[PDB]
């Protein structure tokens, strides 16, 4: 038994040596030449009010106009962000929703939480009302995140330390991803949707192959719980947000940390992260009630989206990069531009 | 300046707002109780008296209570305990027959109670503490002493003194005596006690709002 353990230690040492060999340069040095982004000024274009409790998740539709927000008052609300009109108000079977998703086709929304179930809702019914299409049971812990691949495939992360890929038609988990030793808190599909990455409470992020069903890479830079994870638009990198108050940019090909975004007087955790369309801005939500905008290539804050009276729990950028939505525990979403 | 279909959409949005407000008003009248405790503390019997979270809905003397049994969540409690910030009170269950049981087992119960009571999300949330299996405690204490769990204990082996000692040992874990009250109870009497404690909490919150407290 101990021979396996020492072989594992040797493999970790070899991996570290290879990563160090590939660390000849630092992203900061290479980016020192380019001009920094100015003071990124954004103001609340819209304030989406109507939730009567903490908002825990929000997601944009691929049309960049409709968004769904989940709150623990037991409601999913589909908003028309241009007009602030409530397109739908879906009453949930369990009010402890901690995640929500919008199908890329716009036909379905998903949500889950402490019920350990991911419920898919059919928006495009002929009866004119939204009804639950499928209930995805099989996780033993709370549902932390869920993201559609197609109208029929959804991958979910759970607090039981496993991620699962589901066939919505049958309701069975086609694949189960294991290897995290802590609760999986976030999840992010690659732009091609052939790979996805997940952050866990073990302070490590793991890259998975959707079709092969096994972990390709593991990243362990963070010093604490990872609360959020987002894929860089190119699909060759991803950023993580942790309770240790720092973001960290990892690159799949270089297989190691590239940059860490932190400041001395910001000490709270990070509830969500996201990128702008180019990838120059890395917008992160914090428990100190405001979101910070980071110059992804230069590590320095470019702005602050203050204006929430409580923790900024969720954060998203439209597919066309035209706006940013930030939900909060004060029960208001705000569109910033 | 809106078209006909835009005006109809705005009317739909207003109807949705009205229904949301009605739902929120209805929800406000609900008393939300978080049920916690050790695995074998007797939470099941307490629930009876009234794969993830289990919500129990009961009505007692015109108050509709929602009690959420979250014991099935084996995941990390630190990541979702904030969901229950705002519950009227926490019901905590411990078994008075866990001095010599091990998992020590009462020491685990006190550890969990210390974690829950001094959590930053429950600074002002009142706690209703149920001390279960008092009959089994009465039987067991005659044979095994309380010194096994509390070496510093120096009182008699009678049921009353030992029960009081355990009650104060639990209540002294409260580091914020001023802003939080612990309503200890030895387990229809249970439902009546829950109702009384909840009514007291609600009235004290209202008086705080009105400046009378």
């Amino acid at each position, epitope marked *: 038994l101990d021979q396996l353990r020492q072989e594992a230690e040797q493999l970790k040492n070899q991996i570290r040596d290879a990563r160090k060999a590939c660390a000849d340069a630092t992203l900061s040095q290479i980016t020192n030449n380019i001009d920094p982004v100015g003071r990124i000024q954004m103001r609340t274009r819209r304030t989406l009010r109507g939730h009567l409790a903490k908002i825990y998740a929000m997601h944009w539709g691929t049309d960049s*106009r*409709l968004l769904v927000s989940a709150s623990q008052d037991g409601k999913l609300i589909i908003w*028309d962000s241009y*007009t602030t*009109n409530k*397109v*739908h108000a879906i009453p949930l079977r369990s009010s402890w929703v901690m995640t929500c998703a919008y199908a890329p086709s716009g036909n379905y929304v998903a949500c889950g939480g402490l019920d350990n179930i991911c419920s898919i809702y059919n928006l*495009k019914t*002929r*009866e*004119g*009302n939204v009804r639950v299409s499928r209930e995805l049971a099989g996780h033993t812990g709370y549902l932390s995140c869920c993201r559609f691949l197609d109208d029929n495939q959804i991958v979910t992360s759970s607090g039981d330390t496993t991620c699962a890929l589901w066939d919505i038609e049958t309701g069975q988990q086609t694949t189960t991803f294991t290897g995290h030793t802590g609760d999986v808190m976030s999840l992010s599909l690659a732009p091609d949707t052939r790979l996805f990455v997940s952050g866990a409470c073990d302070a490590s992020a793991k890259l998975w192959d959707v079709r092969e069903g096994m972990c390709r890479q593991t990243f362990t830079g963070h010093e604490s719980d990872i609360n959020a994870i987002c894929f860089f638009p190119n699909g060759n990198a991803f950023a993580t947000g942790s309770d240790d108050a720092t973001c960290r940019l990892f690159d799949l090909r270089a297989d190691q940390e590239l940059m860490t975004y932190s400041h001395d007087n910001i000490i709270c955790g990070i509830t969500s992260v996201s990128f702008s369309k180019s990838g120059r801005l890395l917008l992160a939500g914090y428990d100190d009630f405001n979101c910070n905008v980071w110059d992804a290539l230069k590590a320095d804050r470019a702005g602050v989206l203050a204006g929430h009276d409580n923790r900024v729990s969720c954060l998203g950028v439209t597919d066309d990069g035209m706006a940013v939505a930030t939900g909060s525990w004060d029960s208001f979403l705000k569109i910033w531009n | *300046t809106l*078209s*006909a*279909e*835009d*005006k*109809a*959409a705005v*009317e*739909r949005s207003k*109807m949705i707002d009205r229904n949301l407000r009605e739902d929120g008003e209805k929800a406000a009248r609900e008393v939300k109780l978080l049920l916690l405790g050790a695995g074998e503390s007797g939470k099941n019997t307490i629930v009876k008296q009234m794969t993830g979270i289990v919500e129990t809905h009961f009505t007692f003397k015109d108050l509709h209570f929602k009690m959420f049994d979250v014991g099935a969540q084996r995941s990390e409690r630190k990541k979702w305990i904030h969901c229950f910030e705002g519950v009227t009170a926490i019901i905590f269950c411990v078994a008075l027959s866990d001095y010599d049981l091990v998992l020590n087992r009462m020491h685990a119960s006190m550890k969990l109670f210390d974690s829950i009571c001094n959590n930053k999300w429950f600074t002002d949330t009142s706690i209703i503490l149920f001390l279960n299996k008092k009959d089994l405690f009465e039987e067991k204490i005659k044979k095994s002493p309380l010194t096994i769990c509390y070496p510093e204990y120096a009182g008699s082996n009678t049921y009353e003194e030992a029960a009081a000692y355990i009650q104060c040992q639990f209540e002294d874990l409260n580091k914020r005596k001023d802003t939080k009250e612990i309503y200890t109870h030895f387990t229809t009497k249970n439902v009546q006690f829950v109702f009384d404690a909840v009514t007291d909490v609600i009235i004290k919150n209202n008086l705080k709002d009105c400046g009378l407290f």
Partner: single-chain antibody
Amino acid sequence: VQLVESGGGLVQPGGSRKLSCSASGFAFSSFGMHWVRQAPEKGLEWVAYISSGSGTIYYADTVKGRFTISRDDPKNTLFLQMTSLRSEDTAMYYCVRSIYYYGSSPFDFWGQGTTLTVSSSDIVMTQATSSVPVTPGESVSISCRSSKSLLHSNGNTYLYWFLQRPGQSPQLLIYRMSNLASGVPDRFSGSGSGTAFTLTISRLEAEDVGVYYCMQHLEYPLTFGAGTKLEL
């Protein structure tokens, strides 16, 4: 989804009659309801509208005051009290559901219609071609035109296309001049420039023959075209 109307039959001029439609198979409470009538030898003509929740009601000037539209959401029934009936009111009355939100399809489902017999600033929509000879397998196009431009500042061209086959209620083909309705074959396609619009059918089947009605939803007096007929 079924809308079944009743209350037709002979009525002496100046009398009163109540039309009713029974709604089943859909959330009647969340749909706006329209009444549309069709004279035995004329095209469609909007009559009245009642919004979801009965918060808004509109009538055509020809029936305003005389008629009144009401709905019973718990009973899923829609009513139309017609008083002071006149010979001009002889027509088959349809009940049409319409739900209004971003991306919805108003006028998606029509009822089977009830026949009423009376004993003996509006936008104008023009369908110049009354009839067209057509055979299956070919390609056909139907033109349309309006007095006002139907393109709104929000980017929506509020034009609707309906097909009424012999002995059948109109079926929504296109809504807002480009969006194909659910269940319609892809061979149908709509387009327009804001004031002139066209509907095209490719490799049309033998079941595609009928009268094609154009409708505008930009303003309250909703108005239909004369209708273009395709005959085998």
